[PDB]
Write a protein that holds these residues in place. Structure first.
Motif, PDB file in Angstrom:
ATOM      1  N   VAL A  60      -4.044 -36.563  14.839  1.00 22.25           N
ATOM      2  CA  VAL A  60      -4.234 -36.968  13.426  1.00 22.25           C
ATOM      3  C   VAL A  60      -5.650 -36.663  12.965  1.00 22.25           C
ATOM      4  CG1 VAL A  60      -4.483 -39.010  11.974  1.00 22.25           C
ATOM      5  CG2 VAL A  60      -2.377 -38.623  13.262  1.00 22.25           C
ATOM      6  N   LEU A  61      -6.653 -36.821  13.832  1.00 24.77           N
ATOM      7  CA  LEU A  61      -8.061 -36.558  13.413  1.00 24.77           C
ATOM      8  C   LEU A  61      -8.235 -35.043  13.228  1.00 24.77           C
ATOM      9  CD1 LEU A  61     -10.494 -39.013  15.280  1.00 24.77           C
ATOM     10  CD2 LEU A  61      -9.655 -39.020  12.929  1.00 24.77           C
ATOM     11  N   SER A  62      -7.644 -34.235  14.132  1.00 22.46           N
ATOM     12  CA  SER A  62      -7.663 -32.753  14.060  1.00 22.46           C
ATOM     13  C   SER A  62      -7.041 -32.284  12.718  1.00 22.46           C
ATOM     14  CB  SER A  62      -6.974 -32.130  15.262  1.00 22.46           C
ATOM     15  OG  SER A  62      -7.675 -32.435  16.464  1.00 22.46           O
ATOM     16  N   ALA A  63      -5.904 -32.861  12.333  1.00 23.67           N
ATOM     17  CA  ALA A  63      -5.195 -32.568  11.072  1.00 23.67           C
ATOM     18  C   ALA A  63      -6.078 -32.885   9.849  1.00 23.67           C
ATOM     19  CB  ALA A  63      -3.912 -33.356  11.027  1.00 23.67           C
ATOM     20  N   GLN A  64      -7.061 -33.797   9.956  1.00 25.95           N
ATOM     21  CA  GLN A  64      -7.948 -34.158   8.806  1.00 25.95           C
ATOM     22  C   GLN A  64      -8.899 -33.001   8.468  1.00 25.95           C
ATOM     23  OE1 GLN A  64      -7.706 -36.888   6.821  1.00 25.95           O
ATOM     24  NE2 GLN A  64      -6.020 -37.629   8.092  1.00 25.95           N
ATOM     25  N   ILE A  65      -8.999 -31.973   9.315  1.00 25.13           N
ATOM     26  CA  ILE A  65      -9.744 -30.727   8.976  1.00 25.13           C
ATOM     27  C   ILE A  65      -8.908 -29.860   8.035  1.00 25.13           C
ATOM     28  CG2 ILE A  65     -11.071 -28.770   9.858  1.00 25.13           C
ATOM     29  CD1 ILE A  65     -12.214 -31.543  10.418  1.00 25.13           C
ATOM     30  N   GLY A  66      -7.566 -29.943   8.108  1.00 25.94           N
ATOM     31  CA  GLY A  66      -6.632 -29.119   7.321  1.00 25.94           C
ATOM     32  C   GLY A  66      -6.413 -29.650   5.909  1.00 25.94           C
ATOM     33  N   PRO A  67      -6.048 -28.786   4.941  1.00 22.73           N
ATOM     34  CA  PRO A  67      -5.733 -29.242   3.589  1.00 22.73           C
ATOM     35  C   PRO A  67      -4.434 -30.068   3.462  1.00 22.73           C
ATOM     36  CG  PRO A  67      -5.278 -26.895   3.793  1.00 22.73           C
ATOM     37  CD  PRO A  67      -5.950 -27.325   5.084  1.00 22.73           C
ATOM     38  N   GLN A  68      -3.586 -30.171   4.489  1.00 23.01           N
ATOM     39  CA  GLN A  68      -2.412 -31.104   4.479  1.00 23.01           C
ATOM     40  C   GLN A  68      -2.447 -32.009   5.693  1.00 23.01           C
ATOM     41  OE1 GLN A  68      -1.919 -29.855   1.091  1.00 23.01           O
ATOM     42  NE2 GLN A  68      -0.568 -31.450   1.906  1.00 23.01           N
ATOM     43  N   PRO A  69      -3.368 -32.994   5.729  1.00 17.99           N
ATOM     44  CA  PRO A  69      -3.582 -33.781   6.929  1.00 17.99           C
ATOM     45  C   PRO A  69      -2.370 -34.671   7.213  1.00 17.99           C
ATOM     46  CG  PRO A  69      -5.256 -34.317   5.241  1.00 17.99           C
ATOM     47  CD  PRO A  69      -4.251 -33.382   4.628  1.00 17.99           C
ATOM     48  N   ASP A  70      -1.516 -34.898   6.209  1.00 16.24           N
ATOM     49  CA  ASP A  70      -0.346 -35.802   6.386  1.00 16.24           C
ATOM     50  C   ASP A  70       0.963 -34.994   6.412  1.00 16.24           C
ATOM     51  OD1 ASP A  70      -1.784 -38.488   6.116  1.00 16.24           O
ATOM     52  OD2 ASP A  70      -2.249 -37.550   4.212  1.00 16.24           O
ATOM     53  N   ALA A  71       0.901 -33.675   6.622  1.00 24.50           N
ATOM     54  CA  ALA A  71       2.103 -32.834   6.866  1.00 24.50           C
ATOM     55  C   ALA A  71       3.080 -33.561   7.797  1.00 24.50           C
ATOM     56  CB  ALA A  71       1.677 -31.523   7.476  1.00 24.50           C
ATOM     57  N   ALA A  72       4.383 -33.490   7.501  1.00 24.79           N
ATOM     58  CA  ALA A  72       5.479 -34.041   8.333  1.00 24.79           C
ATOM     59  C   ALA A  72       5.289 -33.577   9.785  1.00 24.79           C
ATOM     60  CB  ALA A  72       6.826 -33.580   7.756  1.00 24.79           C
ATOM     61  N   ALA A  73       4.897 -32.324   9.988  1.00 23.24           N
ATOM     62  CA  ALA A  73       4.896 -31.696  11.329  1.00 23.24           C
ATOM     63  C   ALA A  73       3.698 -32.190  12.163  1.00 23.24           C
ATOM     64  CB  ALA A  73       4.905 -30.184  11.162  1.00 23.24           C
ATOM     65  N   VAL A  74       2.662 -32.713  11.526  1.00 26.81           N
ATOM     66  CA  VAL A  74       1.521 -33.315  12.282  1.00 26.81           C
ATOM     67  C   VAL A  74       2.046 -34.524  13.056  1.00 26.81           C
ATOM     68  CG1 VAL A  74      -0.696 -34.525  12.006  1.00 26.81           C
ATOM     69  CG2 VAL A  74      -0.223 -32.404  10.726  1.00 26.81           C
ATOM     70  N   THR A  75       2.908 -35.323  12.443  1.00 22.36           N
ATOM     71  CA  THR A  75       3.516 -36.530  13.075  1.00 22.36           C
ATOM     72  C   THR A  75       4.391 -36.106  14.264  1.00 22.36           C
ATOM     73  OG1 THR A  75       3.566 -37.458  10.880  1.00 22.36           O
ATOM     74  CG2 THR A  75       4.896 -38.594  12.570  1.00 22.36           C
ATOM     75  N   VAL A  76       5.238 -35.099  14.076  1.00 21.13           N
ATOM     76  CA  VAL A  76       6.101 -34.513  15.153  1.00 21.13           C
ATOM     77  C   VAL A  76       5.232 -34.049  16.316  1.00 21.13           C
ATOM     78  CG1 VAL A  76       7.683 -32.712  15.872  1.00 21.13           C
ATOM     79  CG2 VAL A  76       7.928 -33.753  13.580  1.00 21.13           C
ATOM     80  N   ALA A  77       4.138 -33.342  16.043  1.00 19.88           N
ATOM     81  CA  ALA A  77       3.218 -32.834  17.076  1.00 19.88           C
ATOM     82  C   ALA A  77       2.593 -34.028  17.830  1.00 19.88           C
ATOM     83  CB  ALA A  77       2.151 -31.956  16.434  1.00 19.88           C
ATOM     84  N   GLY A  78       2.067 -35.008  17.100  1.00 24.96           N
ATOM     85  CA  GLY A  78       1.551 -36.257  17.670  1.00 24.96           C
ATOM     86  C   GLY A  78       2.528 -36.880  18.643  1.00 24.96           C
ATOM     87  N   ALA A  79       3.781 -37.060  18.246  1.00 23.42           N
ATOM     88  CA  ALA A  79       4.859 -37.637  19.093  1.00 23.42           C
ATOM     89  C   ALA A  79       5.152 -36.758  20.317  1.00 23.42           C
ATOM     90  CB  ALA A  79       6.103 -37.874  18.265  1.00 23.42           C
ATOM     91  N   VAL A  80       5.254 -35.445  20.133  1.00 24.28           N
ATOM     92  CA  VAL A  80       5.431 -34.494  21.276  1.00 24.28           C
ATOM     93  C   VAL A  80       4.340 -34.688  22.336  1.00 24.28           C
ATOM     94  CG1 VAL A  80       5.460 -32.158  22.099  1.00 24.28           C
ATOM     95  CG2 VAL A  80       6.546 -32.700  19.889  1.00 24.28           C
ATOM     96  N   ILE A  81       3.085 -34.659  21.909  1.00 19.26           N
ATOM     97  CA  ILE A  81       1.914 -34.769  22.826  1.00 19.26           C
ATOM     98  C   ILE A  81       2.028 -36.121  23.552  1.00 19.26           C
ATOM     99  CG2 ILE A  81      -0.584 -35.002  22.975  1.00 19.26           C
ATOM    100  CD1 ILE A  81       0.517 -32.101  22.464  1.00 19.26           C
ATOM    101  N   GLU A  82       2.187 -37.220  22.819  1.00 21.54           N
ATOM    102  CA  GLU A  82       2.136 -38.563  23.457  1.00 21.54           C
ATOM    103  C   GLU A  82       3.287 -38.674  24.449  1.00 21.54           C
ATOM    104  OE1 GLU A  82      -0.259 -40.432  23.768  1.00 21.54           O
ATOM    105  OE2 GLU A  82       0.245 -42.537  23.865  1.00 21.54           O
ATOM    106  N   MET A  83       4.472 -38.209  24.093  1.00 22.11           N
ATOM    107  CA  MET A  83       5.626 -38.265  25.022  1.00 22.11           C
ATOM    108  C   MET A  83       5.369 -37.488  26.303  1.00 22.11           C
ATOM    109  SD  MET A  83       9.112 -38.183  22.902  1.00 22.11           S
ATOM    110  CE  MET A  83       9.209 -39.174  21.429  1.00 22.11           C
ATOM    111  N   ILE A  84       4.740 -36.305  26.217  1.00 22.68           N
ATOM    112  CA  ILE A  84       4.424 -35.515  27.439  1.00 22.68           C
ATOM    113  C   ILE A  84       3.391 -36.327  28.240  1.00 22.68           C
ATOM    114  CG2 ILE A  84       3.370 -33.386  28.331  1.00 22.68           C
ATOM    115  CD1 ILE A  84       4.557 -31.913  25.933  1.00 22.68           C
ATOM    116  N   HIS A  85       2.418 -36.939  27.587  1.00 20.56           N
ATOM    117  CA  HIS A  85       1.391 -37.742  28.292  1.00 20.56           C
ATOM    118  C   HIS A  85       2.098 -38.848  29.105  1.00 20.56           C
ATOM    119  CE1 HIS A  85      -1.881 -40.022  29.511  1.00 20.56           C
ATOM    120  NE2 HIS A  85      -1.761 -40.978  28.545  1.00 20.56           N
ATOM    121  N   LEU A  86       2.881 -39.683  28.437  1.00 18.39           N
ATOM    122  CA  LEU A  86       3.621 -40.829  29.025  1.00 18.39           C
ATOM    123  C   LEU A  86       4.439 -40.329  30.201  1.00 18.39           C
ATOM    124  CD1 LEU A  86       4.669 -42.865  25.876  1.00 18.39           C
ATOM    125  CD2 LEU A  86       2.794 -43.258  27.485  1.00 18.39           C
TER     126      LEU A  86
END
Lengths: 309, 309
Positions: A60-86
């Motif tokens: 989410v902090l990385s996405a704040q550099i982009g002009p669409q920090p709240d893009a639907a796909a930023v949330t999907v990417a966040g969930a993908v990363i955290e699930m692989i971590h867990l």
């Protein structure tokens, strides 16, 4: 505090509340997707799934550099990363025969990975490619942890911790619409942050003070595990008594404090703190190449947290 | 024999040699991709990786319905399926605490899954989606094996064995350019074949004759495991002595043969053979809806093999 999200102070309250809601949409997405799993899964999946949620925060902090920090796909990417971590935690705890049993831990983690894969299929070809390449590095790293010993450790933490946070920056940048150059800098930033995070964790676990979660030091000594400050300490000219303690798991609570005050007083604790300061400088460099936006200050507060927590 | 490939007689020699080369290109692709893995991986990955290669055969036979049976992507799909299959074996052998140790078996399988993911990223969005959905079913099935007991077993073998061979037919059909209708029939065919294969395996393991690989029966009795013919046998009105033997692992070689001749003489061995004949009929039905091409005869020889091996 109205300025803090997932353990780091982001400055302005309107910014921190924007980032907070982003991390909350990652949270909601993961819970929705995990709760669809067949009943026989529930017990296993929800066991290791609240959190500090450092990876969602980074994404989410990385996405704040982009002009669409709240893009639907930023949330999907966040969930993908955290699930692989867990998922990696489940698999580590089996091969370590570890507390954080191994009954059905292989299959659950295996689910978190299927599910991760399900979500990343929504982001398109290059994202599926990025994640595949990342999980592959992540394994090799845990793998190499399984076996220049110092070079080897640093390759391990780059593969096992660095890669995935690198992917978080890359996907946060891409799906927020950041430039090609900005994407590469957030990826590099993520790789270094992940590396410094693990080294800081390893120093903290020897330092006499308690950790973030109030934990006493010495776990790594007790588990036998060799971390950066130990690896340096072992190859000095006393260093012989250390060698015997560190030779395997330590279960006697006095040998623990003995091994500790031996590690703390080692030139090894100096060599390791220097390595950390070099990765912290590398992180701050990548930060200086980002634009002067609230996103950059927030990422600087994150580096500051990473290298002192 | 010049007509046989991976344990089944396909009829014409020009056809069997076409299919043989297809299975060989799957083989070559998998070896190329696995040998790129970091040294620390080699020992783990190549250990469970020759074979009977039933899934590659099914994938290549499914593609023979399509107008491009030798499409580049049929080989990629074949390799994806076989790698996911191999990966499940690694993970099963940990949670069973199994011979086919558990040191680094979680991470290796985890690699075969990363790599699988790497290749499927080449096939595009829907393929990544198909595989994600499949691995997810596959887990739930192994998972449910971990816990109407008979309904439950059949749900298990549909999830753990059926799903993946269903995916092989679906991807073989898609990447060979088969019609939408043909793709669905090869998918359904694959799901049933996988289900009959597991049930046949379970009957064979009680039958007094040795298996394909020359193995004596009784393993499932010895390991404690409950298979279709045992599940039926347990809920009959003698059936009490069976209940005690089957209550857990059997290590006494006379109780093994005792449990056997008790299972063989059970109405349960009749109920289970009837279930097999119903799945065999369902397979042959899906076959009759395919066009009258050498591909169909070859798939009929495969069903014939599945339900008698």
């Amino acid at each position: 505090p109205a300025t803090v999200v997932a353990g780091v102070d982001l400055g302005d309250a309107v910014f921190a509340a924007a980032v907070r809601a982003g991390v909350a949409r990652v949270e909601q997405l993961m819970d929705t997707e995990l709760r669809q799993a067949d009943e026989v899964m529930s017990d296993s999946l929800l066991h290791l799934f609240g959190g500090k949620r450092f990876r969602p925060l980074f994404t989410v902090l990385s996405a704040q550099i982009g002009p669409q920090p709240d893009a639907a796909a930023v949330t999907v990417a966040g969930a993908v990363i955290e699930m692989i971590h867990l998922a990696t935690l489940y698999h580590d705890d089996v091969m370590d025969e570890a507390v954080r049993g191994n009954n059905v831990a292989i299959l659950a983690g295996d689910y978190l990975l299927a599910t991760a894969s399900r979500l990343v299929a929504r982001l398109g070809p290059e994202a599926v490619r990025i994640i595949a390449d990342t999980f592959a590095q992540l394994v090799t790293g845990q793998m190499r942890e399984t076996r220049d010993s110092i070079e080897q450790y640093l390759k391990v933490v780059q593969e096992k911790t660095g890669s995935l946070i690198g992917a978080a920056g890359r996907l946060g940048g891409m799906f927020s619409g950041a430039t090609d150059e900005q994407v590469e800098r957030l990826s590099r930033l993520g790789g270094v942050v992940g590396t410094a995070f693990q080294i800081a964790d390893d120093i903290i676990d020897i330092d006499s003070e308690s950790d973030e979660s109030g934990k006493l030091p010495g776990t790594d000594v007790r588990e036998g595990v060799h971390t950066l400050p130990m690896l340096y300490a072992l190859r000095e000219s006393d260093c012989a008594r250390l060698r015997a303690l560190l030779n395997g798991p330590v279960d006697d609570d006095a040998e623990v404090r003995e091994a500790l005050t031996l590690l703390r007083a080692s030139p090894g604790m100096a060599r390791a703190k220097d390595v950390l300061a070099q990765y912290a400088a590398q992180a701050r460099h990548e930060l200086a190449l980002l634009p002067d936006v609230p996103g950059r200050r927030a990422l600087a507060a994150l580096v500051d947290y990473t290298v002192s927590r």
